[model samples]
Target: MRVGALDVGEARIGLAVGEEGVPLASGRGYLVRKTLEEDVEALLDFVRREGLGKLVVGLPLRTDLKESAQAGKVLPLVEALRARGVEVELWDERFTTK
Candidate 1:
């Protein structure tokens, strides 16, 4: 199975892709603060072109084990993906920056 990973940030979103039997992930590129439509369109294009079976999203949590303000932004994107019938999983990321 092929999987796609996303590192979402305020200014940009980083992307990576990996295959089921591969141990390495490769960077795709960064998406600037474009409109939401453009961002989702890019993701869909990648998913279709790469034949990805899953999408992994890193969810940021606070040090106290709570969702931060940034985490709230993920819902809309997730919802959009779900609406588009894309398979997505939210991975808990405690120390993503490190």
Candidate 2:
């Protein structure tokens, strides 16, 4: 089954696509956020278009293994995705820096 990954943030959502075993590369393009509903719909559209069976969402956890402030912001999207029956996985994205 194919898989997709999202690095969701305030302004834009980064995207990647891959399958099992291999690391995903960042070339799938990104979404310029308009609203939560739009973000969900855009993502679901991509999911359908790419035939993604699973989605891995980046979880912004702190160094202490606690959810960062931004993590709270990201939860609603995850919840929304799950509510729509998208199989979503929260992956640690601590130390994700430039």
Candidate 3:
């Protein structure tokens, strides 16, 4: 199954794909955050277009390992994706954007 990765933020959603050793969609920039419906539609479009079977997303946390406020932003999206039948994995993402 193919995989896709996400770097979700308030302004945009960065994307990546391919397997652990090969990169399929790296350095491709981000999708500007639009309305909730449009954003999800666009995301599903990309997933279908690339035939992604799994979605890996950054799980942002503070250096102390406490949940960062930003974490809330993506968790709901994760649940939403799961409800829509997308396989999702949350990766440790402390300092990923720093």
Q: Among these predicted structures, which one has the highest TM-score?
A: 2
Superposed by TM-score, candidate 3 places the C-alpha of residue 10 at a distance from the truth, in angstroms, of 5.6
Query: How far off is residue 84 in model 3, in Å?
Result: 4.1
lDDT per residue, candidate 3, 28-69, as tens digits?
447876665665677778876777857787664554567543
After superposition, which runs of candidate 2 have C-alpha atoms over 4 Å from their true positions?
8-10, 20-26, 61-77, 94-98
**Better by TM-score, candidate 3 or 2:** 2
Tens digits of per-residue lDDT for model 2, 1-98: 57787775567778888764454464478877555566667777888777785788766555455744354345556776688787888776445678
Q: CA shift at 9, candidate 2, in angstroms?
A: 5.6
TM-score of each: 0.63, 0.64, 0.61
Q: Estimate the lDDT of model 1.
A: 0.67
Candidate 3 residue pairs in clash (backbone atoms < 3 Å): none
Clashes of 1: 0
Candidate 3 Cα errors over 4 Å, as ranges:
8-10, 21-25, 61-77, 94-98
Ranking by lDDT: 2, 1, 3
Q: Candidate 1 on 2-75: residue-level lDDT in tens?
A: 68877755677788877533445567676665665666677777877777857877675454557543543445
